[PDB]
Design a protein around this ligand. Structure first.
Ligand SMILES: CCCCCCCCO[C@@H]1O[C@H](CO)[C@@H](O)[C@H](O)[C@H]1O
Ligand SMILES: CCCCCCCCO[C@@H]1O[C@H](CO)[C@@H](O)[C@H](O)[C@H]1O
Lengths: 255, 255
């Protein structure tokens, strides 16, 4: 796990837990009346072992390799006959406990504003199926309205914040443009103090080192300081903005 | 196989071949309209892995042991995930060929009047699914009317012949009973010549030895000489009959 990308590691881990637990949601009367119209054949009177490899020709960009397909096919008969009727209690329970503790340690350091709407939505189910009555679930439910957005069309969902990146770009554009009226000074200061306050300085809570994470020291995020994720792209623009504002007079922009 | 009983070995071997080939008969319109009324639940909408161990309390005489059930459960996941989607070509083909050649070598020596109606019926299907157009199948079909029988009730099926055993018992009873009228001599001779002709003297065709069979030399069967199966029960009565008839005068019973 210390080799794969961070996004894949944080997305597939709840998927791994859900697959291990084999959790299925309750079959409401809507589900039974809607599952028939979707499939072209009867719901329960079809096969599933040979239906696993059927890729559409419209949504196919990177086809699977022969080795990957062979590995998946071998794993299907290696795991399902074994860890479903005679599951290894020790191994499976340790894996589930490690996944749960890793998710709990990750969300606390991320202030429950974890990367990705899909990842947060899946983590909410992952923590709800473990304890429907807790405080982590309630706090996850509380940050849900932080992603909805409205536009000319109906309500949409914002994948992640981008205020810092656009603010830095706008500040750079304003300082590069000639100060004709010179009245942009108050706005420049009122943005510069926010930029200074947006710097992430504290280390992640707990043993962030040796936990499949990288050291963060005076780093910048892409969305906001409440996330605490290092990203070299935004830091490079922030440093340029700070250096360009450094040569500006103190009496006009402030400290 | 040289350890188990002969009847079990000759009965389960066609069962083994049928299970290995996974042969299923054609689904006629009668089958689809009759498979629904039998099962209390829908035909295809039920489970089968956990339905394997459900023994009735009326037809249970020798319950399965824990070790036997564990062995079957382990074999179910050892064989089905392996030898159904990725079958060992060499091992399975050699096993099927050996079963076919063993059945063919056994039926030729048995003159197609093999032991048991169920075993013969299963062997007929086993040889038909291999070659519907042959001579062994036709000769098996020709000996079918050798088992049907009629009585006061409707037509029945006779599992095996018993003419020799009853003939020996009747001959012993007649010779033990005092010859009052002494006119039973012609009948005694007309039965004694048949008894002499009923002795199995030839060895089974081919290499009967070292083929999971026992040596037969001047043995007797239970049904008729056309079978060629050693049985110590009938031989003991036949020897007693021969010895008791030996002391009888030659001029009255013949040679
Ligand atoms: C030291 C070996 C102990 C037995 C291991 C059996 C194979 C692992 O398999 C698991 O083991 C569990 C505990 O026995 C059982 O519930 C089942 O056999 C199975 O779930
Ligand atoms: C020397 C190994 C050759 C490949 C055999 C793999 C194990 C045998 O097993 C069988 O072999 C088939 C033929 O390859 C494959 O379809 C599957 O592995 C299986 O059906």
């Amino acid at each position: 796990p210390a080799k794969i990308w961070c996004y894949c590691r944080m997305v597939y881990m709840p998927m791994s837990y859900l697959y291990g637990k084999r959790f299925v949601g309750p079959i409401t009367p809507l589900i039974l009346q809607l599952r028939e119209e979707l499939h072209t054949q009867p719901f329960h009177e079809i096969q599933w072992r040979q239906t696993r490899h059927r890729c559409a020709k419209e949504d196919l960009y990177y086809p699977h390799s022969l080795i990957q397909d062979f590995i998946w096919d071998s794993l299907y008969v290696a795991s399902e006959p074994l860890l479903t009727r005679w599951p290894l209690n020790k191994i499976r329970e340790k894996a589930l406990a490690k996944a749960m503790e890793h998710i709990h340690y990750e969300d606390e350091n991320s202030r429950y504003i974890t990367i990705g709407c899909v990842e947060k939505a899946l983590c909410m189910l992952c923590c709800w199926v473990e304890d429907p009555n807790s405080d982590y679930f309630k706090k996850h439910l509380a940050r849900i309205p932080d992603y909805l957005w409205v536009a000319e069309d109906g309500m949409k969902v914002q994948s992640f914040g981008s205020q810092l990146w656009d603010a830095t770009f706008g500040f750079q554009a304003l300082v590069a443009s000639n100060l004709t009226e010179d009245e942009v000074g108050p706005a420049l200061a009122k943005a510069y103090d926010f930029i200074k306050k947006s710097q992430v300085k504290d280390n992640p809570s707990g043993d962030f080192e040796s936990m499949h994470r990288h050291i963060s020291k005076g780093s910048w995020t892409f969305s906001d300081q409440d996330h605490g994720w290092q990203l070299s792209d935004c830091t490079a623009e922030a440093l340029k903005c700070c250096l360009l504002a450094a040569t500006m007079p103190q009496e006009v922009v402030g400290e």
